Amino acid sequence: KYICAECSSKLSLSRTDAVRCKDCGHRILLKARTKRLVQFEAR
Amino acid sequence: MIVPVRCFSCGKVVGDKWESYLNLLQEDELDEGTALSRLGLKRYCCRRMILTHVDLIEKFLRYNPLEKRD
Amino acid sequence: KPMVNESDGVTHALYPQEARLRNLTYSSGLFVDVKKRTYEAIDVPGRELKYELIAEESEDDSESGKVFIGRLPIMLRSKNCYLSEATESDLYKLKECP
Secondary structure, eight states: OEEESSSOOEEOOOSSSOSOOSSSOOSOEEOOOOSSOOOOOOO | OOOOSBOTTTOOBOTTHHHHHHHHHHTSOOOHHHHHHHTTOOSHHHHHHHHTOOOOHHHHTTSOSSOOOO | OOEEEOTTSOEEEOOHHHHHHHTOOOEEEEEEEOEEEEEEOOOOTTSOOOOEEEEEEEOTTSGGGEEEEEEEEOOTTSSSSGGGGOOHHHHHHTTOOO
């Protein structure tokens, strides 16, 4: 999964698809945080 | 940056009083010293906490973590 | 005004955010008019050459006369930059620091 940079539209991209937004057509794409919260210990 | 919850020196709590403190300044048009003493802030360290606070949370809030320029 | 042409050949105005994030260079383009003239004279030995106007290429009446000459960097907030006339809400939506 990913997310747009202007409108923050929800997008899914493959390993070959162009790195663009479908609605706004921008070239800046952000990831999405790990949906499953993972517990950790600081060592 | 939101108001500190506790006083760094005497352990007291000042976090909840910020909203009510802002009320006295323009609704009642009081001065700063009397407003500070109206809320039980008597040691000058608590007065230091409330008096010299820069509230930066109202500027980040008009903004998004995506696309700042330079 | 500053703008960028991608590898695909598409042209879009460049803004400081994209230059910062994408490692671009904030700059614009320069256009200069060019005119050409050809003179021809009969080289008679012992006499001064007298050239006469024959051909003059000047495309001032068409947009093709503007010869592209290069790209010039732009300093922020100067006259050309988009930031010059931006209000506080304009700076926020473009995400400037006021």
